[PDB]
Structures are given as structure tokens and as C-alpha cells.
Ligand binder design. Structure first.
Ligand code: NA
Length: 204
């Protein structure tokens, strides 16, 4: 497929849910302190699934360890640990054992600052890219690498479903951590390497 290209660290990408077609998304709005059932959220930045194309779908895929200046040509591979930086808010994807908006059993997904992501909350910002049918050393590619995104501390899978969030979440889809990895509803794909120009050698 001409749009199936190996993804490199520091690329900016869009991440699309295979079954619902929603894009992984974020924006400045926060989770409410209390849900209707009385549970308490982290009040962190919302992470949602959004059906349309906009800049709030853009995430930069980054390495898992200490901060380093950008390098070119470092391919992401099956089962690598990664961070995902939301470009529009300059925050870092995080999950933790706080119950999600609609599923008391599933982990909340949110974002955190650079200082948190490379400091005391670093472990909670690491996610494994588990390619469906992946083999050791296999390169992660746009379009063709269907994958599950596994939170490294807890082994929950990033998940979504169709029933929209309330108005506080802009009636977008919930994103949370599924305790079961096997379901096909845990499958995502990278639709576009946004940062990689159309004339770049990597597309040849
Ligand atoms: Na582009």
C-alpha cells in the first residue's frame, strides 16, 4: 500500500479505531470532579475519540526513556514502549488506576505535562505498541500495522466504544483501559504520518 510506511520516533501520526473509525483525540477540557454515580475523576485533560479530521487528532510518537533531542530514522518496532505527545496541547498520554467515565472497571486515560511525563509519573506514560500478528523486530507501519496499545504498568488496552460521552465531553467517544486484551475492539491503526511530507524519500 503506498500509504503504508514505517513509522519513526518523532513522527506525528493519527491513530484511528478500526471498528468505530474514531480518531484518538484530546483538547483542553477536563474530566468533571464527579460522575453521575458519585465517583471521583482525576480532573485531568480529556482523551476522546473524534470522528472528524482536525489538528487535535495529532500525536507525536516518542521514545520511552529519558528525554533526548530528536533523531532521524529510528523505526518504531513491535512491542516497543512509546510515549504519545498531543501536539495541540503539548501534553503526554497517561493512564492510571482511576476509574473511567462510564466503566468503573476500566482505567481513565488523560494527559500530563512534560515535567510529569519525564518525572514522577513517567511509568504511567509508557505504552506498548503490540502489532496484530507481529513478529520480533517487525517495523510499525502506517495503514498495515493494526495494533493494540497496552499500558505498560497495568496491561490495560486502549479501548473505545460508540455511546457518546455527555455534553461535558463534547459528545465524543470515551477512551479507557480495557482489562481484556483479546477483543477486536482494542484494535487501532495509524492512518497518516502527518509530519512526513508527500515528497519525502521515506515514501518512495
Ligand atoms: Na502531512
Amino acid at each position: 500500500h503506498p500509504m503504508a510506511v514505517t513509522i519513526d520516533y518523532w513522527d506525528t501520526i493519527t491513530i484511528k479505531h478500526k471498528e468505530t473509525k474514531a480518531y484518538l483525540h484530546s483538547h483542553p477540557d477536563r474530566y468533571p470532579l464527579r460522575y453521575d454515580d458519585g465517583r471521583v475523576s482525576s480532573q485531568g485533560q480529556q482523551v476522546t475519540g473524534y470522528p472528524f479530521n482536525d489538528t487535535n487528532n495529532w500525536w507525536q510518537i516518542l521514545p520511552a526513556g529519558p528525554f533526548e533531542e530528536p533523531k532521524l530514522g529510528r523505526h518504531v518496532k513491535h512491542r516497543d514502549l512509546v510515549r504519545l505527545r498531543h501536539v495541540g496541547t503539548d501534553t503526554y498520554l497517561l493512564s492510571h488506576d482511576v476509574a473511567s467515565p462510564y466503566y468503573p472497571t476500566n482505567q481513565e486515560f488523560t494527559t500530563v505535562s512534560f515535567n510529569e511525563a519525564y518525572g514522577d509519573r513517567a511509568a504511567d506514560t509508557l505504552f506498548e505498541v503490540r502489532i496484530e500478528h507481529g513478529k520480533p523486530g517487525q517495523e510499525f507501519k502506517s495503514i498495515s500495522s493494526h495494533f493494540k496499545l497496552i499500558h505498560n504498568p497495568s496491561k490495560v488496552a486502549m479501548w473505545t466504544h460508540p455511546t457518546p460521552l455527555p455534553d461535558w465531553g463534547h459528545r465524543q467517544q470515551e477512551i479507557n483501559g480495557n482489562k481484556q486484551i483479546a477483543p477486536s475492539s482494542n484494535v487501532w491503526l495509524v492512518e497518516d504520518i502527518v509530519s512526513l511530507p508527500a515528497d519525502h524519500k521515506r515514501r518512495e
